[PDB]
Structure 1
Amino acid sequence: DTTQQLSLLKHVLSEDKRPIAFIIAAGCPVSIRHNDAPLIPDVAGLTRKISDSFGGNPDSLLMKIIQNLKTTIPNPTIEDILSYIRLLQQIPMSGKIHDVENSVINALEESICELIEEEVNVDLPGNATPYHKIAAWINSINREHQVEIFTTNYDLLMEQALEELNVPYFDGFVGSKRAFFDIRTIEENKLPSRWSKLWKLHGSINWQLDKQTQTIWRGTPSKGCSLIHPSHLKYDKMPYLVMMDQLKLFLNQPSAILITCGYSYKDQHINEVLSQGLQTNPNALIYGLQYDVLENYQEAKDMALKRSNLILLAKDRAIIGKKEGEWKPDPQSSQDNDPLLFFKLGDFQHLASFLEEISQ
């Protein structure tokens, strides 16, 4: 598998007549090792650290909500929990469901948001991080089509790497003191070609909301961010639809390319927007790379089997245009014992190293 797909990927990436896009999920931040431990424990960590923070006491409302959701959702996540409390606080839930916390739901969600901001407030150590390598690859060669990045994370690590290496980009906001979400440049879509475009689909930690005029602005991480939403907020104090429109518009461009690293296709909206974009333009390609085994990605299998221009690649098998194949007999593992054929190049560290090698 390695030779042919790697060579084709090198040819398609090295060209400058095609757009290039990335999708960055929690896999990229967790791929950075710190003190022999993951830098950030991902979406699952933002769940069980929260669970352990409130202790084993069942009198706490959070644990009761957890055990209620296991009755319906076998594997609830922190995004679902945040959505559930946001739904509860949208109406005067004074019933027996929220009888214990007549008004402590707001305190609980504020505490959750504070803990999330505390945990996702880190910085890139040194200059050997994979984000620096990706930024170096982006700035290495001038390409006639812009490089776009879509991130579902809340961290500023990608921006830190882009700014350290002096890579210009436009994330949507314009201004210096309290940058306003400038809209008309977004659909004007004639910015200088050397600029990059970083879209934060799920918001970020530096976005804040002023309720006096009900307007959003990008600032600095302060005590309480009102745009930590995992795609759950009001209608268009909401830039989420604009970023989704930008992704859809990009996917409709001819000869489009896109790579997903660290994504597990567990979000319905992303999957359906990708399906609409792929069906709209048959020339669009997605070189999905999974760090986990293919057996654990059912939605990825459904997406690959329902579309023809989605070259899904996993650690063990692959789906190249609705047809499934496995690894051919090759000396992938030198050791005779346990001759597992694994695609070790799907890791974010290995992906960044590959991009650096292509840059050189």
Structure 2
Amino acid sequence: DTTQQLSLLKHVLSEDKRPIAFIIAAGCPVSIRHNDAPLIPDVAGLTRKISDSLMKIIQNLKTTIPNPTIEDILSYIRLLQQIPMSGKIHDVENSVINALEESICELIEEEVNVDLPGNATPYHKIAAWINSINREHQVEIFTTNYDLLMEQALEELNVPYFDGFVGSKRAFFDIRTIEENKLPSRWSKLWKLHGSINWQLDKQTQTIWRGTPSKGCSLIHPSHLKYDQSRKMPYLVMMDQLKLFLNQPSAILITCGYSYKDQHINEVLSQGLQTNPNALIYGLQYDVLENYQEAKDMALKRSNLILLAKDRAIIGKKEGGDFQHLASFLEEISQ
């Protein structure tokens, strides 16, 4: 039963000489409790908070789409923004779009600007477990959150991490550091797929410099124009780094809180699983196993895919979650 793959995961963690990593979704911080309340609101909570603060566009989008998320709303707003005379599509006087997007950005900015709690955070336990292993294979972690909680957790233990950016209040984006990929093994690497409120673009050119959070402008969900010969706002570089990590010798990788609701991530995951035969994904499911149809389909299609849920477990394409629990298990295995 459960003891089988528990011992299996303990053994593969004890199996060195192979790279390890993790995927952080919005569920892990949401399940973290601060003052008996979630530290970070969920996607539904974020949408409700946004609605708390011009629903014609939402109603129009609801005709062809079910209950949307913040990403779809902001993408639609920007898409109307590029169109010059897009105001006539929804009422008139296309100036409410800029004010609405600025207000939404501000609301998100002070919504996600939350300091990490004390030493009881399991992020500290994860960082300690990672640092306690002296394996040559460095760990590169990709997250989807719009905050910098993991940055604070890693910086609280003096753990070396690199996010692709270096410098000062106007730190630039070093492009070829990923190219030659020549870094000491002691260092670790970090990537934010959708970014945080830290990154901000520049008026003169698309530089997306990192630094002190500027007033008014923030970069989130990179989907802007890519006609500037890359280096504009590249999530493609993160995707390429993920593909390279899938192209190295096969290793079993895990994930935390992933809902398998990202088509871009799902496509590259399927491509990596097809290219690397022994590649294994240890994505769990802290919910009903029937609530993840995409995960079940991926497990059925890819034999090497491993899926575990609260009510069932899909192992070997045949059917059969807490971040704190995983952190405690890792800490116990480390000792």
TM above 0.5:
yes
**2:21 alignment partner, SS class:** strand
CA distance in 1, matches of 2:302, 2:182: 31
Structure 1 residue 356 corresponds to structure 2 residue 331: yes
How many residue pairs match? The answer is 331
Consecutive unaligned residues in structure 2, runs of 5 or more: none
* Alpha-carbon offset, residue 79 of structure 1: 0.8
Cα-to-partner distance string for 1:3-49 (whole Å, 9 max, x where unaligned): 01111111111222111111101111112101211111122222111
* Alpha-carbon offset, residue 144 of structure 1: 1.5
Contact 1:152–1:201 (8 Å) recurs in 2:
yes
CA distance in 2, matches of 1:231, 1:138: 32
Contact 2:200–2:208 (8 Å) recurs in 1:
yes
CA distance in 2, matches of 1:285, 1:23: 14
CA distance in 1, matches of 2:34, 2:122: 13
Change (3 A) 1:42 1:235: farther
Change (3 A) 1:235 1:251: farther
* Alpha-carbon offset, residue 164 of structure 1: 0.3
- The answer for the alignment partner of 1:172 in structure 2 is 164
Cα-to-partner distance string for 1:129-188 (whole Å, 9 max, x where unaligned): 011111011111111211110001111110101000111011101223422110111111
Contact 1:179–1:218 (8 Å) recurs in 2:
yes
* Alpha-carbon offset, residue 100 of structure 1: 4.0
TM-score relative to the length of structure 2: 0.95
* Alpha-carbon offset, residue 192 of structure 1: 0.5
Contact 1:201–1:231 (8 Å) recurs in 2:
no
CA distance in 2, matches of 1:301, 1:269: 18
Change (3 A) 1:120 1:285: same
Cα-to-partner distance string for 1:222-272 (whole Å, 9 max, x where unaligned): 322331125555456212111110011001111222211111011100110
Deviates more, 1:89-98 or 1:27-36: 89-98
CA distance in 2, matches of 1:225, 1:42: 23
**2:201 alignment partner, SS class:** strand
* Alpha-carbon offset, residue 99 of structure 1: 2.2
Cα-to-partner distance string for 1:84-138 (whole Å, 9 max, x where unaligned): 1111111113454222452110110111011011100011111110111110111
Contact 2:198–2:218 (8 Å) recurs in 1:
no
Contact 1:24–1:261 (8 Å) recurs in 2:
yes
Contact 1:21–1:257 (8 Å) recurs in 2:
no
* Alpha-carbon offset, residue 275 of structure 1: 0.5
**2:208 alignment partner, SS class:** strand
Contact 1:154–1:203 (8 Å) recurs in 2:
yes
CA distance in 1, matches of 2:170, 2:226: 21
When the two chains are superposed, the root-mean-square deviation of aligned CA atoms in Å is: 1.5
CA distance in 1, matches of 2:87, 2:147: 37
Query: Percent same amino acid at aligned positions?
Result: 100
Structure 1 residue 321 corresponds to structure 2 residue 296: no
Change (3 A) 1:252 1:33: same
CA distance in 2, matches of 1:225, 1:278: 38
Deviates more, 1:98-107 or 1:198-207: 98-107
Deviates more, 1:244-253 or 1:94-103: 94-103
